[PDB]
């Protein structure tokens, strides 16, 4: 849980099946684990469910980190080929979980909404006002520390 | 203006003999007006005008095609004409001695939205001269 919950780590299930997959073979009791994944038919169905689940998890964590990632690298990270990776990307976008736009002939993706110039200059002005407030606070701080330091 | 209309049509088309005939017919008034030297200058710059219009029309037009269109019948003469147009700067048609490539346009840049306001903000200058004329022309008695 500590590994797979947070901090957006690369959930390569091929690595996980041995790094944290010991519950399948032998653990403390491994009985719920054998019920879930150690089964044959429903077990393999739940194995595939882990596989895709981690695929969407990797896609989601990549969404908040990488703006444009090349198709080969994304497919390698998803442990699938180009067509399978684009199919799962489509499966996410039709669910509206991610804001993704892809050039299929170029095979290049983008996750950032086109910034309208109105709010672009608005955040620019907010940055300006943050800088102005920082100037005010720094001025007061340095002037007062100057007073305390020339109290000699 | 009827012969002037035919002159405009000849300028657009690129033909020579028809407007030469009409000049030989009714060019005496042009001489009286004093534009007959300019008249012949247009007669031989009809190809330049047609080249400008066809360059505005086309993106990558063949030099052979433009020569055929404007009755040049010569690839080298077509190349020279497009060279002369680009050095005159009337059009943006360039030369690639491979086949006659010409660049296309681009989306709007920093100054492409500002050149109208830059060339038009004399509106307030007109307003101020109008107000000063009023100040001069508001005598009470």
């Amino acid at each position: 849980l500590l590994k797979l919950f947070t901090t957006m780590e690369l959930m390569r299930w091929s690595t996980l099946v041995e790094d944290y997959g010991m519950e399948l073979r032998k653990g403390s009791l491994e009985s719920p684990a054998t019920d879930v994944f150690g089964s044959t038919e429903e077990g393999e169905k739940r194995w595939k469910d882990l596989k895709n689940r981690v695929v969407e998890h990797n896609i989601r964590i990549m969404a908040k980190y990488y703006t444009r990632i090349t198709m080969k690298r994304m497919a390698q990270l998803l442990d699938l080929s180009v067509d399978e990776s684009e199919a799962f990307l489509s499966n996410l976008v039709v669910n509206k979980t991610i804001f993704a736009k892809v050039d299929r002939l170029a095979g290049i993706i983008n996750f950032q909404r086109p910034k309208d110039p109105n709010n672009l200059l608005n955040d620019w002005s907010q940055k300006l006002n943050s800088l102005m407030s920082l100037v005010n606070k720094t001025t007061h701080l340095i002037a007062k520390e100057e007073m305390i330091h020339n109290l000699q | 203006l009827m012969p002037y209309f035919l002159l405009t049509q000849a300028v657009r088309t690129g033909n020579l003999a028809k407007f030469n005939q009409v000049l030989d017919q009714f060019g005496e008034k042009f001489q009286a007006d004093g534009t007959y030297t300019l008249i012949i200058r247009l007669r031989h710059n009809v190809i330049k005008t047609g080249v400008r219009m066809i360059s505005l029309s086309y993106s990558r037009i063949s030099l052979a095609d433009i020569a055929q269109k404007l009755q040049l019948d010569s690839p080298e003469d077509a190349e020279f004409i497009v060279a002369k147009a680009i050095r005159d700067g009337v059009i943006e048609a360039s030369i690639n001695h491979e086949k006659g490539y010409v660049q296309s346009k681009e989306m709007i840049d920093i100054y492409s939205t500002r050149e109208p306001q830059l060339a038009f903000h004399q509106r307030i200058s007109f307003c101020l001269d109008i107000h000063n004329m009023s100040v001069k022309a508001m005598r009470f008695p």
């Binding site: 110039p117 109105n118 709010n119 200059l121 608005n122 620019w124 002005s125 300006l128 102005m132 100037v135 | -």
Partner: protein
């Protein structure tokens, strides 16, 4: 309103009344209210003149320090509400377009002042004057100049 007066005894009225003394100063801007006039006060003796101790070291301190806007003139605000504000400005000045239209076809040949007095419309030429268009222009150019000044500062 800070109006100060004095109560008088019965003798001031039986002597030469209006206890206002012989000078031309308390007659300056001396407009007692109707209720003050109908009451004895502000009518018994006089109305006192008011003055404010606008001494320096005090008034300069107030004007310099209290009404304080000192680094607040650097605001940029290019389009925080200004895209829709410009939409609204265009709609208002389209209403002005209709108004100035209406005026130019009114434009009667009978000394148009005669038409205008009886057909006031409070249009762009008459009441929605060039001052409002100047306000719009000043807003636009102020945002423009702030943005451009900070753009050239951005080095």
């Amino acid at each position: 309103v800070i109006d100060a007066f004095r109560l008088i005894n019965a003798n001031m009225m039986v002597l030469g009344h209006e206890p206002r003394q012989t000078t031309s100063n308390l007659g300056h801007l001396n407009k007692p209210s109707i209720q003050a006039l109908i009451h004895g006060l502000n009518r018994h003796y006089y109305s006192i003149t008011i003055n404010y101790r606008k001494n320096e070291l005090e008034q300069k301190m107030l004007l310099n320090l209290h009404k304080k806007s000192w680094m607040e003139g650097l605001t940029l605000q290019d389009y925080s509400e200004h895209c829709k504000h410009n939409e609204s400005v265009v709609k208002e000045m389209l209403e002005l377009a209709k108004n100035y239209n209406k005026a130019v076809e009114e434009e009667d040949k009978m000394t148009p002042e005669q038409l205008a007095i009886k057909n006031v419309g409070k249009q762009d030429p008459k009441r929605h004057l060039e001052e409002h268009v100047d306000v719009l222009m000043t807003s636009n150019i102020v945002q423009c100049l702030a943005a451009m000044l900070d753009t050239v500062v951005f080095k």
